[PDB]
Design an enzyme around this catalytic site. Structure first.
Site, short mmCIF file in Angstrom:
data_model
loop_
_atom_site.label_atom_id
_atom_site.label_comp_id
_atom_site.label_asym_id
_atom_site.label_seq_id
_atom_site.Cartn_x
_atom_site.Cartn_y
_atom_site.Cartn_z
CB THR A 14 -18.28 14.17 -1.45
OG1 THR A 14 -18.96 14.64 -0.28
CG2 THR A 14 -18.86 14.85 -2.68
CB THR A 15 -18.84 9.90 -5.39
OG1 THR A 15 -17.92 9.13 -4.61
CG2 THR A 15 -18.67 9.57 -6.86
CE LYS A 44 -22.69 14.67 -1.10
NZ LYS A 44 -21.63 13.64 -0.99
CB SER A 79 -18.98 8.25 -1.40
OG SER A 79 -18.08 9.32 -1.62
#
Lengths: 230, 229
Positions: B1-2, B33, B170
């Site tokens: 996740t970025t 997100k 990611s």
């Protein structure tokens, strides 16, 4: 009969008589006035003393609720203290849960909702005081009045107490658009001094507070040497 | 996740990848997100998907009622405080890193970071997720404060691309949203049009020389790519 013994009972004409009796108790209290001056709010109350040996500042009726908000009590002082405690709880909840000072209208609505809840249950009686909420929040200067019935109304100028009609008539002579807090303090003090009867309340004091730009938008009492002597 | 958020003069730009991964398998490659809190306030979520979704839904419900109660708009600081309180009371049971970014007429554009610990820091830019560790030196070298709106969006997309080029957790789409005094505008750019990836980078085109042909010399002459040669 039994139609006026508790608040949970409506009368045949749709009235709640206990709330009216509480309002009557408010109407027998000392006079208070308030003015919204487009740059701040100034409130002034008269305190009647039954003793000449009271320390100065006894029976304060104006109390700071937040940094920018304050409440003046017209009526039963302990009930006003309870209402002030509730308002302080409401103001700090906003500063702790929402990280923002409570708006004047929001605080007035909370005070009205708190006062109204005591007019709906048989186990409680209505508050015997009216609350004058003076705030300078992000919604500008705000002046509200909360009735023992729990209804709140915003005003430019308002008067409560025994000498209410004459004080209101004196307030009708102001402009409220060019009026500033510096002269509004003197105007309210002069109105309170003129409308008060000198042969029934021997010991009287004028207690004035305000929140405008001159106090960095902080609700404080006036400097001692600012109100007129009489 | 970025996830990341960068403030420009008008408002803020929120950027995120689209990849929910169960360790080493991609469960979702089109995640979103960037979660709406109010019209002009959003949050970037990293960590446990269920925990962050529940936190965002609860905060959005709290903020929606608050607007009706006060009859005015909500500052970004209020949403930041709501997340900070809710994440601090549950810091031992949830795995969540939150970025709260938005626009309010009073304070302009604001960005707040709420890490797993439960603190709240007001910053010009914030990074989060597993891929954020790759971006810090990217921001120290290539980020200049005071960019325009389009420049900020382009830089955020480039940073996200650089982040998931190196992070296995990611990848996928790049989602950006711009929040300012105007209407908030979203954008989703795919991987095949991403501003950067190592597959299209000319300096990684030549393969490392690992499969030496059997030779009579110590001279390195490239990899053996044929049986005869």
């Amino acid at each position: 009969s039994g139609h006026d013994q508790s608040t949970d009972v409506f009368s045949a004409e749709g009235r709640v008589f206990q709330v009216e009796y509480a309002g009557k108790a408010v109407d027998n209290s000392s006079t208070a006035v308030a003015a919204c001056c487009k740059d701040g709010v100034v409130v002034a109350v008269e305190k009647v003393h039954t003793s000449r040996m009271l320390e100065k500042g006894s029976n304060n009726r104006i109390h700071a609720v937040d940094r920018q908000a304050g409440i003046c009590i017209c009526g039963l002082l302990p009930d006003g203290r309870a209402i002030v405690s509730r308002a302080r709880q409401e103001a700090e909840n906003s500063r702790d849960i929402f990280a923002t000072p409570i708006r004047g209208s929001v605080l007035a609505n909370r005070v009205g909702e708190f006062m109204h809840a005591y007019t709906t249950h048989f186990a409680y009686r209505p508050f015997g005081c009216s609350a004058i909420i003076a705030s300078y929040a992000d919604d500008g200067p705000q002046l509200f009045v909360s009735d023992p019935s729990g209804t709140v109304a915003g005003y430019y100028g308002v008067a409560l107490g025994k000498a209410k009609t004459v004080a209101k008539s004196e307030l009708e002579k102001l402009d409220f658009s060019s009026l500033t807090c510096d002269e509004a303090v003197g105007k309210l003090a002069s109105i309170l001094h003129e409308v008060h009867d000198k042969q029934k309340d021997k010991l009287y004091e004028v207690e004035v507070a305000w929140v405008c730009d001159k106090s960095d938008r902080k609700f404080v009492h006036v400097p001692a040497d600012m109100v007129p002597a009489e | 996740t970025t996830i990341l958020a960068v403030s420009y003069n008008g408002g803020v730009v929120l950027a995120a990848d689209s990849r929910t991964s169960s360790g080493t398998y991609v469960v979702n490659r089109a995640s979103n997100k960037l979660t709406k809190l109010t019209k002009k306030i959003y949050c970037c979520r990293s960590g446990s998907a269920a925990d962050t979704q529940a936190l965002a839904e609860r905060v959005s419900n709290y903020l929606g009622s608050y607007q009706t109660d006060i009859g005015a708009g909500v500052n970004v600081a209020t949403a930041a405080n709501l997340f900070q309180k809710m994440c601090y009371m549950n810091r031992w049971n949830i795995s969540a890193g939150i970025i709260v970014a938005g626009y309010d007429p009073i304070n302009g554009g604001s960005v707040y970071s709420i890490p797993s610990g439960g603190s709240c820091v007001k910053l010009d830019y914030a990074l989060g997720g597993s891929g954020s560790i790759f971006l810090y030196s990217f921001f120290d070298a290539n980020y200049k404060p005071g960019m325009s709106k389009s420049e900020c969006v382009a830089f955020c997309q480039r940073a996200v691309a650089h982040a998931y080029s190196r992070d296995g957790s990611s990848g996928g789409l790049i989602r950006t949203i711009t929040l300012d005094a105007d209407e908030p505008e979203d954008q989703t750019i795919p991987w095949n049009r991403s501003p950067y990836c190592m597959e299209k980078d000319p300096k990684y085109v030549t393969q490392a020389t690992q499969n030496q042909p059997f030779s009579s010399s110590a001279k390195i002459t490239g990899n053996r790519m044929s049986s005869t040669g």
